[PDB]
Amino acid sequence: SITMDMVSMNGEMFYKIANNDAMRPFFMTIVSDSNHWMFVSSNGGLTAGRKNAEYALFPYYTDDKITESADITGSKSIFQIQYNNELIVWEPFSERFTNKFKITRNLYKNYYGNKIIFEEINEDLGLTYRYQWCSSNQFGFVRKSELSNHSKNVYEISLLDGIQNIMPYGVSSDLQSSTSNLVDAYKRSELHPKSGLGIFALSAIIVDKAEPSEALKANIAWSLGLNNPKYLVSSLQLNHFRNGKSISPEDDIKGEKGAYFLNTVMTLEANTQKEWMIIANVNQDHSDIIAITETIQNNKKIAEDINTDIELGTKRLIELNASSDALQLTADNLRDTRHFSNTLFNIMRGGIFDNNYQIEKGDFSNYIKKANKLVFDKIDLNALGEIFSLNDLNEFASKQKDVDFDRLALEYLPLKFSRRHGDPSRPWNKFSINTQSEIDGSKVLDYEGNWRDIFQNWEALAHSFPNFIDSMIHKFLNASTFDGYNPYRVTKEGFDWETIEEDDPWSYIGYWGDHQIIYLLKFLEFIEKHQPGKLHSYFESECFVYAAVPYTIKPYEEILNNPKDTIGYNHEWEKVINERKKSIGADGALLKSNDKSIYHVNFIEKILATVLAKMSNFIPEAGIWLNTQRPEWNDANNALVGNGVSMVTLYYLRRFLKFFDQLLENSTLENIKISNEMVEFYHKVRETLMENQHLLAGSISDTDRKVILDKLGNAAADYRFQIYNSGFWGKKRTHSMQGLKNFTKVSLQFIDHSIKANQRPDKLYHAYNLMSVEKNKEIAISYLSEMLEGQVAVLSSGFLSSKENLAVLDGLKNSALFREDQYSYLLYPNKELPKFLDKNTISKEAVSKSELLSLLVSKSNKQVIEKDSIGEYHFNGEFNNASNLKQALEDLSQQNEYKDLVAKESKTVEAIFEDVFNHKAFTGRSGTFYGYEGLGSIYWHMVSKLQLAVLECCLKAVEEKESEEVIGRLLEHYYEINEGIGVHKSPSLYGAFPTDAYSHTPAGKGAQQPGMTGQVKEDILSRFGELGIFVKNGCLELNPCLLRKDEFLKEAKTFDYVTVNFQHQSLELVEKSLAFTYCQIPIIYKIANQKCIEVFTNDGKSAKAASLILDKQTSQDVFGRTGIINKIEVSILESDLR
């Protein structure tokens, strides 16, 4: 019944889901190259607009309400067909004529994801009606209609076709959501008769102020292709038509939802098709409307111009995506399409570079101006042209000898196309596609994003633009604080931090525990692979700075006493930053020193800052203590903040410190140079670990655990207190590189020991642990459920052998994390929550052995306890937690009858409350709901992290020449995890188009939350790994070991790609080959008898070698996007394919 096929629709390739109406309706995003947004259900319900929800063409509501609105909002079509002497009414896509006809519903979405087609075949009449949504930068939304008569009959048809519940310009999304009825009273919908154009406006902008409020813009709709239609500008007469009656034209309707309907009569001959289109746009002023009315009346080629602008949209989309290596052609179009959409969601969320490594002087100059007024006035930019390269900027920067200019030049990232990732299925996220200027509609180079979201997206991005890696690293490091954390957002301007609300007690700020180590590390690994020795050149270079986030992490004894109350907002420090920002610009948000308006440190110091912060929270055998008033990756386990401890972060810290240790061993420097203030901190942490090394021979006692945490935590506390209170003085001291290597080696000894104490009997590893302070002298550890995140982390740690990695995965597959129906992985075990009648029952014994509770029973008091009519006892139904119970006990104590007893038995009743509800075990909402991160739900990003981790484990096994059994069994895991991701699943099992990413699939539905998930970043890296694209020692290697034979073409095909110079070009592929791009160079793999690589250059030469590793220089020609290399062909042995 429900199949998916590649099909040709009007000479373009689409995926067709046949009988999509047999699926529970699923939600999609239709992507544009421009600023269109469209969120649409498979049933046709939608919201759409341009830029943001404040310019909605159709109302912006949550995805459930959108799906539920298909009958009254959006596309609507009714046909009165003359058949014999009968008038027959057909209303495709509606539920108004249930089982009246045999029908087939099909749904199509194109390979680019910017067009969707809805189709209904009326089998009884042999009629098919299609409509398709397209985007046009110039014209807005375009709905292309086709009515096709494939019968042998001739029909007289009266049709009514259009769009309804059209928003007028100027209604806020909040008002439309909460007060839609009031808005109706201000609606005026009008037709311009000369043109047939519909104008949808308000009589006045709705405003609480008692002043004039003119509404001088409108939404519009118009059409082409129908002869002499009658128009409706409302849905008032819709039902009359539905009941086989004729309609009256409307040109001026007040007080009603806007609509735009065309009515015409026609004779549809057998084996013929009639076509028309409707165009709708938002945010139109008088001049915009007149230009359209003039074009309708005077421009005989208007239809052709619309079609041209639609195709330009696709073309611009391809250029954006192709520049991040979106284009692949294999035997498997599903994987090809999934790679394209993966790349698009990655660049939509993190951005894409404007034009290779090219920079415009105007934009660069404004950036410097906003950043630092004193650098801007000092540095003369005459010597740069209107356009210059990143290498030009670097050569220029080296002549200015200004470390602030060095930093700002290096941080500059000419990204465009990024937007925050809100939509009706993520309605708590406010989105805005700010990609065309309010002024002239030209491109906007800007970006903003949440810390972990954007730095994740950039890891994938960097692979297509490697020479920007330095920029990204400086951006990350320089936006990090001296106490080793970071603000929640980065922007082109700089960064933003969260503030406190009102005097609201439940409003608090902090730092996320995962934000630093793993995301930094992926960048450091990348640069050391592409440019070995480059990090070494930063070791002594004092060009890095400290982000001044005005958060005060409290003294150690206060944290230990209450680890949920650990960070205060420093309002006086905010005053100083605001003054500096008025006076310098964005650079005013950096730490000054006593001497210098901006304090500068080197790379070694920055790594120490973040590493000492982590080590200062290291609880041996437990992990990194979570005590910074924010969780890590999983927001649904946010209650672990306080007594929770992250082994996840420790596994990554192992990888990090192993990397750093290798980095230092390869250095020739004998010394390091760090802030004087850091010396005591650094030395105290190092010394603590050194003198406790001997404990690693065995397990560490609860007593020793606390001795160690106390020394580490006191040392950090002393350091931050000094800096918070007297700042950095500006003097640095020289210490030995050998000491730093010693610090790194001993830190690793402790971490390794801790990892070995964290294996479960089933061979999984602990993810998050609990700590408690016992007898003021000890720290005890307890454990939580098996969690997927812990397995991803330990498998990424670099610590285990290949056999051990395999044992972990065998355990994972055999564990309660494996979900059978989707053959993928939960975040934690599914579990039965107590049914309503089973959650709140106090044992008869506990009641009769409590004088307080017994007294409340016999006196019929129901403030705390109640007896039902079968004799069972319950806590008051208003209680959410113990605080409500305590509150209630306070209320009882202000009565004479209960006063003595409250003081006596209150701890006891609180203890009975804890026995019933077991709130000590609460980790967060994860364990108490049934979607998103909750029970029985697959959260795909984490599965895709597993996949990448397992890929890395596979490469290790191959590179170390493990047995074929071990390698094979790891591959078995790799390919199964990959299959679980679901690209080859049926639509009915996937629950949507399998080529589109979604954030999660809950137990009782298909895929939920379309588009911009971080999952896509992981699946891009995995695809590159799978293709055998490896960079080591500055050298590009193209040498697949995980790639399957069945990816190679079975027939000849044409690969249409885009060069680095925006040229749309073609290569002919033959059987036994495939193609992709890397740094936007086309790469062809062909099966051959001998290994060989052939590099074709722009000068018409080619060069061959048997080796599939390219030299440093050729590799930098690839990475550099200079256009010197036209293509690369790799000849691969059949025997090396899987």
Ligand X SMILES: OC[C@H]1O[C@@H](O[C@@H]2[C@@H](O)[C@H](O[C@@H]3[C@@H](O)[C@H](O[C@@H]4[C@@H](O)[C@H](O[C@@H]5[C@@H](O)[C@H](O[C@@H]6[C@@H](O)[C@H](O)O[C@H](CO)[C@H]6O)O[C@H](CO)[C@H]5O)O[C@H](CO)[C@H]4O)O[C@H](CO)[C@H]3O)O[C@H](CO)[C@H]2O)[C@H](O)[C@@H](O)[C@@H]1O
Site for ligand X in 1004-1063 (CB under 6 A): 1044
* Chain residues 66-105 in contact with a second copy, contact rule CB under 8 A: 68, 71-72, 89, 91, 95-100
65: partner contacted, choices ligand X, a second copy, Cl ion, none (Cβ within 5-8 A by kind): a second copy
Provide CB contacts within 8 A for 234, sequence distance 6+.
189, 250, 253, 256, 257, 258, 259
Structure-token match 């087609």, residue found: 117
Q: Which of 387, 816, 833, 1052 binds a second copy (CB under 8 A)?
A: 833
Residue 261, H or E segment: strand 258-268
Strand residue runs (E) in 111-196? 116-122, 127-136, 140-149, 155-166, 187-192
With left for phi above 0 and alpha for psi between -120 and 50, is residue 165 left, alpha or beta? left
**Alpha-carbon span 1118 to 1031, nearest angstrom:** 11
- Beta bridge pairs of residue 39: 29, 47
1044: partner contacted, choices ligand X, Cl ion, a second copy, none (Cβ within 5-8 A by kind): ligand X
430: partner contacted, choices a second copy, ligand X, Cl ion, none (Cβ within 5-8 A by kind): Cl ion
* Chain residues 732-751 in contact with a second copy, contact rule CB under 8 A: none
Instruction: Please give the biggest Cα pair distance in the chain.
Output: 100
Nearer to Cl ion, 258 or 1014 (CB): 1014
- Options 136-144, 330-338, 918-926, 1106-1114: segment touching a second copy (CB under 8 A): 918-926
CB of 282 to a second copy, least distance (A): 12
CA distances from 898 to 237, 875, 887, 895, 905 (A): 69, 17, 14, 6, 10
Under the criterion CB under 6 A, does residue 971 sit at the interface with ligand X? yes
- AA letter at 468: F
Radius of gyration of the chain (CA): 32
Nearer to ligand X, 269 or 965 (CB): 965
Q: Specify whether the CB–CB gap between 153 and 270 falls below 8 A.
A: yes
Each residue 624-643 as x (binds a second copy by CB under 8 A) or -, in order, gives -------x------xx-x--
Pairing mode, strands 197-202 and 358-360? unpaired
Pairing mode, strands 187-192 and 230-232? unpaired
* Chain residues 155-174 in contact with a second copy, contact rule CB under 8 A: none
Each residue 380-419 as x (binds Cl ion by CB under 5 A) or -, in order, gives ----------------------------------------
Q: How many residues bind Cl ion (CB under 5 A)?
A: 1
Under the criterion CB under 6 A, does residue 969 sit at the interface with ligand X? yes
Nearer to a second copy, 243 or 776 (CB): 243
Under the criterion CB under 6 A, does residue 65 sit at the interface with ligand X? no
Each residue 100-119 as x (binds a second copy by CB under 8 A) or -, in order, gives x-------------------
CB of 51 to a second copy, least distance (A): 14
Closest Cα to residue 255, out of 170, 181, 163?
181
Q: Which of 897, 979, 1071, 1111 binds ligand X (CB under 6 A)?
A: 979
Nearer to Cl ion, 52 or 330 (CB): 52
**Alpha-carbon span 202 to 216, nearest angstrom:** 9
Nearer to ligand X, 384 or 807 (CB): 807
Helices marked H in 1047-1129: 1112-1119
- Options 430-438, 650-658, 668-676, 1122-1130: segment touching Cl ion (CB under 5 A): 430-438
Under the criterion CB under 6 A, does residue 820 sit at the interface with ligand X? yes
Q: Specify whether the CB–CB gap between 760 and 768 falls below 8 A.
A: no
Nearer to ligand X, 386 or 820 (CB): 820
Tokens linked to 708: 């160690």
**Alpha-carbon span 808 to 795, nearest angstrom:** 8
Q: Specify whether the CB–CB gap between 746 and 738 falls below 8 A.
A: no
Q: How many residues bind a second copy (CB under 8 A)?
A: 105
Closest Cα to residue 31, out of 335, 348, 323, 480?
348
Nearer to ligand X, 646 or 978 (CB): 978
Closest Cα to residue 72, out of 102, 49, 93?
93
774: partner contacted, choices ligand X, a second copy, Cl ion, none (Cβ within 5-8 A by kind): none
- Options 120-128, 563-571, 725-733, 970-978: segment touching ligand X (CB under 6 A): 970-978
Under the criterion CB under 8 A, does residue 876 sit at the interface with a second copy? yes
Measured distance between the N- and C-terminal CA atoms of the chain, rounded to whole angstroms: 33
Helices marked H in 667-736: 676-690, 702-726
CB of 178 to a second copy, least distance (A): 6
- Options 141-149, 511-519, 968-976, 1053-1061: segment touching ligand X (CB under 6 A): 968-976
Q: Which of 245, 430, 731, 919 binds Cl ion (CB under 5 A)?
A: 430
- Options 811-819, 836-844, 973-981, 1120-1128: segment touching a second copy (CB under 8 A): 836-844
How many Cβ atoms from other residues are within 10 Å of residue 426's Cβ? 19
871: partner contacted, choices Cl ion, a second copy, ligand X, none (Cβ within 5-8 A by kind): none
976: partner contacted, choices ligand X, Cl ion, a second copy, none (Cβ within 5-8 A by kind): ligand X
- Options 96-104, 595-603, 683-691, 967-975: segment touching ligand X (CB under 6 A): 967-975
* Chain residues 927-966 in contact with ligand X, contact rule CB under 6 A: 964-965
Q: Would you say the C-alpha torsion 324, 544, 508, 714 has a positive or negative sign?
A: positive
Nearer to ligand X, 289 or 977 (CB): 977
**Alpha-carbon span 599 to 730, nearest angstrom:** 7
**Alpha-carbon span 524 to 659, nearest angstrom:** 9
* Chain residues 488-507 in contact with ligand X, contact rule CB under 6 A: none
CB of 949 to ligand X, least distance (A): 17
In the sheet that 155-166 helps form, which strands lie side by side, from edge to edge?
86-90, 74-83, 155-166, 258-268, 230-232
Under the criterion CB under 6 A, does residue 1112 sit at the interface with ligand X? no
CB of 173 to a second copy, least distance (A): 10
- Options 105-113, 248-256, 676-684, 988-996: segment touching a second copy (CB under 8 A): 248-256
**Alpha-carbon span 379 to 365, nearest angstrom:** 10
- AA letter at 804: E
Nearer to Cl ion, 407 or 419 (CB): 419
**Alpha-carbon span 103 to 100, nearest angstrom:** 9
Which residues are at the interface with ligand X (CB under 6 A)? 820, 823, 964-965, 968-969, 971-972, 975-976, 979, 1044, 1138
User: What residues line the site for Cl ion (CB under 5 A)?
Assistant: 430
